[PDB]
Design a protein around this nucleic acid. Sequence first.
DNA 1: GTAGACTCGGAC
DNA 2: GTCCGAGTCTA
Length: 273
Amino acid sequence: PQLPEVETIRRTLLPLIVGKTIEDVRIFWPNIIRHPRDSEAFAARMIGQTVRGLERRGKFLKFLLDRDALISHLRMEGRYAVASALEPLEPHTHVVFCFTDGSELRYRDVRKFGTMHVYAKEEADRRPPLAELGPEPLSPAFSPAVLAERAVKTKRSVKALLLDCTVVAGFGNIYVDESLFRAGILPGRPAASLSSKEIERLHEEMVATIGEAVMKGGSTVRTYVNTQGEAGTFQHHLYVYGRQGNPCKRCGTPIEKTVVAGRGTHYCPRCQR
DNA sequence: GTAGACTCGGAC
DNA sequence: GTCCGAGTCTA
Ligand SMILES: [Zn+2]
């Protein structure tokens, strides 16, 4: 899940937990808890607090409690669900927050890559991982000017640049390949090789791509759904991601797949320069 | 500052 | 064996 996915999860999860008081916190896979490092302390400090709100920062969910903030990252396959405490638990449930009303917030993650950090509300923003996060793509803090700034200070590919959460928040593998194709730029291009026109173009497309995505509930390509288990629909609007060997939707040239910045990369050798 | 290797487990 | 909507730790 990237910005669009997490944003949908956020909007649909809030009403299901807002105003509930944590009665217990059960942990079946301690490694997910990053801070405090001792899982017993993590659990003990949550008890008695009420869920006041749910915010997003890049791909992170920020649960606002009374004095604390629970920072959660789903990474590759983490997922939330609110259900009854009387029902058996589905497989791969690693952390459960029990509310005083008998319902509970369950966190599932087949790969166990997800993380959880709990800090006093005022410390959350000045501590990792929210600490070195770049600006929100959909906000003025993210402008062509800002992007140009980081591009020159490096020889690495533009794809590696965009995947860097310190440059811009929330862009992942799918939307990077998709924005580069829309901007007509090869992902392997050195970040510096880009020009002023190419930079403002990329910015334009990043904002539109990410934008259309949230408005469609995200991209379900394998295991993503909102807290209601509903599937997004932006994956029907994908130009390159996951379409290797298939004709480009614009020019008909077969989409190619390579490894760039250590990850699967899709692009149209004809339309992207 | 930056290329790699985990952290893990189920679907082809 | 290969593939994977992520991002911190290495060397
Ligand atoms: Zn094309």
